[PDB]
Design a protein around this ligand. Sequence first.
Ligand SMILES: O=P(O)(O)O[C@H]1[C@H](OP(=O)(O)O)[C@@H](OP(=O)(O)O)[C@H](OP(=O)(O)O)[C@@H](OP(=O)(O)O)[C@H]1OP(=O)(O)O
Ligand SMILES: [Mg+2]
Length: 144
Amino acid sequence: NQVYSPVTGARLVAGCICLTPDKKQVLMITSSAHKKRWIVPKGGVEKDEPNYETTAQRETWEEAGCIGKIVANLGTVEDMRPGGGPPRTEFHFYELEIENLLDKFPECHKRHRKLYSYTEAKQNLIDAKRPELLEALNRSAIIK
Ligand SMILES: O=P(O)(O)O[C@H]1[C@H](OP(=O)(O)O)[C@@H](OP(=O)(O)O)[C@H](OP(=O)(O)O)[C@@H](OP(=O)(O)O)[C@H]1OP(=O)(O)O
Ligand SMILES: [Mg+2]
Protein backbone atom coordinates (compact mmCIF):
# COMPACT_ATOMS: atom_id res chain seq x y z
CA ASN A 1 0.00 0.00 0.00
CA GLN A 2 3.16 2.26 -0.13
CA VAL A 3 4.10 4.65 -3.03
CA TYR A 4 7.61 4.72 -4.67
CA SER A 5 9.42 7.18 -7.03
CA PRO A 6 9.04 6.28 -10.76
CA VAL A 7 12.64 7.64 -11.26
CA THR A 8 14.81 6.52 -8.26
CA GLY A 9 12.41 3.81 -6.93
CA ALA A 10 12.85 5.57 -3.51
CA ARG A 11 9.96 5.33 -0.96
CA LEU A 12 7.86 8.57 -0.78
CA VAL A 13 7.59 9.87 2.84
CA ALA A 14 6.08 13.15 4.18
CA GLY A 15 6.41 14.81 7.65
CA CYS A 16 6.14 18.11 9.63
CA ILE A 17 8.57 20.47 11.42
CA CYS A 18 5.95 21.50 14.07
CA LEU A 19 6.96 24.92 15.57
CA THR A 20 5.25 26.94 18.39
CA PRO A 21 3.67 30.39 17.71
CA ASP A 22 6.86 32.21 18.97
CA LYS A 23 9.05 29.92 16.68
CA LYS A 24 11.35 29.15 19.70
CA GLN A 25 10.60 25.37 20.11
CA VAL A 26 10.00 22.35 17.74
CA LEU A 27 7.96 19.15 18.47
CA MET A 28 10.07 15.93 18.56
CA ILE A 29 8.89 12.29 19.05
CA THR A 30 11.00 9.24 20.05
CA SER A 31 11.77 6.70 17.26
CA SER A 32 9.76 3.40 17.40
CA ALA A 33 12.73 1.40 15.90
CA HIS A 34 15.08 2.69 18.74
CA LYS A 35 13.28 4.10 21.86
CA LYS A 36 16.06 6.61 22.94
CA ARG A 37 16.54 8.41 19.54
CA TRP A 38 14.54 11.68 19.02
CA ILE A 39 13.10 12.41 15.50
CA VAL A 40 10.20 14.46 13.92
CA PRO A 41 6.76 13.18 12.75
CA LYS A 42 6.88 11.62 9.22
CA GLY A 43 5.64 8.48 7.38
CA GLY A 44 4.91 6.66 4.09
CA VAL A 45 2.58 8.24 1.48
CA GLU A 46 -0.36 5.85 0.64
CA LYS A 47 -1.99 5.18 -2.81
CA ASP A 48 -5.33 7.06 -2.24
CA GLU A 49 -3.66 10.28 -0.86
CA PRO A 50 -4.04 13.29 -3.24
CA ASN A 51 -1.01 15.37 -1.99
CA TYR A 52 1.90 15.28 0.57
CA GLU A 53 0.20 17.80 2.94
CA THR A 54 -2.39 14.99 3.62
CA THR A 55 0.33 12.42 4.58
CA ALA A 56 2.30 15.01 6.65
CA GLN A 57 -0.77 16.12 8.72
CA ARG A 58 -2.06 12.49 9.13
CA GLU A 59 1.37 11.23 10.41
CA THR A 60 1.73 14.44 12.56
CA TRP A 61 -1.59 13.49 14.31
CA GLU A 62 -0.96 9.69 14.62
CA GLU A 63 2.70 9.91 15.83
CA ALA A 64 2.55 13.16 17.92
CA GLY A 65 -1.16 14.10 18.55
CA CYS A 66 -0.35 17.54 16.99
CA ILE A 67 -3.03 19.65 15.19
CA GLY A 68 -1.92 22.82 13.33
CA LYS A 69 -1.79 25.03 10.19
CA ILE A 70 0.78 24.20 7.43
CA VAL A 71 2.43 27.66 6.84
CA ALA A 72 5.35 26.58 4.54
CA ASN A 73 6.69 23.91 2.10
CA LEU A 74 10.32 23.08 3.15
CA GLY A 75 10.97 21.02 -0.06
CA THR A 76 12.57 17.51 -0.16
CA VAL A 77 15.62 15.83 1.51
CA GLU A 78 17.00 12.33 0.69
CA ASP A 79 18.28 9.44 2.92
CA MET A 80 21.60 9.27 0.96
CA ARG A 81 23.51 6.52 2.87
CA PRO A 82 26.95 4.76 2.75
CA GLY A 83 28.28 3.39 -0.59
CA GLY A 84 26.75 4.28 -4.00
CA GLY A 85 23.23 3.52 -5.34
CA PRO A 86 19.95 5.50 -5.27
CA PRO A 87 18.36 6.85 -2.05
CA ARG A 88 15.95 4.55 -0.14
CA THR A 89 13.66 7.45 1.03
CA GLU A 90 12.52 10.80 -0.53
CA PHE A 91 11.20 13.04 2.35
CA HIS A 92 8.71 15.91 1.66
CA PHE A 93 8.61 18.26 4.73
CA TYR A 94 6.22 21.12 5.67
CA GLU A 95 6.48 23.74 8.46
CA LEU A 96 3.33 23.59 10.67
CA GLU A 97 2.22 26.13 13.34
CA ILE A 98 1.09 24.17 16.47
CA GLU A 99 -2.56 25.16 17.20
CA ASN A 100 -3.28 22.23 19.62
CA LEU A 101 -1.31 19.34 21.29
CA LEU A 102 -3.71 16.51 22.35
CA ASP A 103 -2.85 14.30 25.41
CA LYS A 104 -4.28 11.21 23.57
CA PHE A 105 -3.44 10.09 19.96
CA PRO A 106 -2.97 6.71 18.15
CA GLU A 107 0.76 6.16 19.14
CA CYS A 108 0.86 8.09 22.51
CA HIS A 109 1.64 4.71 24.26
CA LYS A 110 4.45 3.72 21.76
CA ARG A 111 6.39 7.10 21.79
CA HIS A 112 7.32 10.08 24.07
CA ARG A 113 6.88 13.71 22.83
CA LYS A 114 8.53 17.01 23.98
CA LEU A 115 9.19 20.64 22.82
CA TYR A 116 12.97 21.37 22.43
CA SER A 117 14.97 24.60 21.81
CA TYR A 118 16.72 24.73 18.36
CA THR A 119 20.11 24.00 20.09
CA GLU A 120 18.95 20.76 21.84
CA ALA A 121 16.85 19.64 18.80
CA LYS A 122 20.01 19.88 16.57
CA GLN A 123 22.00 17.69 19.05
CA ASN A 124 19.13 15.11 19.17
CA LEU A 125 19.09 14.59 15.33
CA ILE A 126 22.95 14.26 15.36
CA ASP A 127 22.66 11.74 18.28
CA ALA A 128 19.81 10.09 16.24
CA LYS A 129 22.20 10.08 13.17
CA ARG A 130 19.54 11.80 10.96
CA PRO A 131 21.19 14.82 9.26
CA GLU A 132 18.51 14.72 6.44
CA LEU A 133 15.95 15.64 9.22
CA LEU A 134 18.32 18.39 10.52
CA GLU A 135 18.58 19.81 6.94
CA ALA A 136 14.72 20.05 6.90
CA LEU A 137 14.70 21.67 10.42
CA ASN A 138 17.26 24.33 9.22
CA ARG A 139 14.95 25.17 6.23
CA SER A 140 12.15 26.01 8.80
CA ALA A 141 11.71 29.53 10.37
CA ILE A 142 12.97 28.33 13.83
CA ILE A 143 14.95 30.85 15.99
CA LYS A 144 18.62 29.82 16.71
O1 LIG B 1 7.69 1.46 7.29
P1 LIG B 1 9.01 0.76 7.56
O2 LIG B 1 9.49 -0.07 6.38
O3 LIG B 1 8.98 -0.04 8.86
O4 LIG B 1 10.11 1.92 7.72
C1 LIG B 1 10.80 2.21 8.97
C2 LIG B 1 9.98 3.20 9.77
O5 LIG B 1 9.75 4.40 8.94
P2 LIG B 1 8.33 5.15 8.72
O6 LIG B 1 7.94 5.83 10.02
O7 LIG B 1 8.59 6.17 7.61
O8 LIG B 1 7.34 4.07 8.32
C3 LIG B 1 10.72 3.63 11.03
O9 LIG B 1 9.97 4.70 11.68
P3 LIG B 1 8.94 4.50 12.91
O10 LIG B 1 7.54 4.89 12.48
O11 LIG B 1 9.03 3.04 13.31
O12 LIG B 1 9.47 5.44 13.98
C4 LIG B 1 12.10 4.17 10.69
O13 LIG B 1 12.79 4.44 11.95
P4 LIG B 1 12.99 5.94 12.52
O14 LIG B 1 12.14 6.04 13.76
O15 LIG B 1 14.47 6.11 12.81
O16 LIG B 1 12.53 6.88 11.44
C5 LIG B 1 12.91 3.16 9.90
O17 LIG B 1 14.18 3.77 9.52
P5 LIG B 1 15.62 3.18 9.99
O18 LIG B 1 16.32 2.82 8.69
O19 LIG B 1 16.31 4.32 10.71
O20 LIG B 1 15.43 1.96 10.89
C6 LIG B 1 12.17 2.78 8.63
O21 LIG B 1 12.94 1.78 7.89
P6 LIG B 1 13.26 1.95 6.31
O22 LIG B 1 14.76 2.14 6.16
O23 LIG B 1 12.76 0.67 5.65
O24 LIG B 1 12.49 3.16 5.81
MG1 LIG C 1 6.59 7.01 10.64
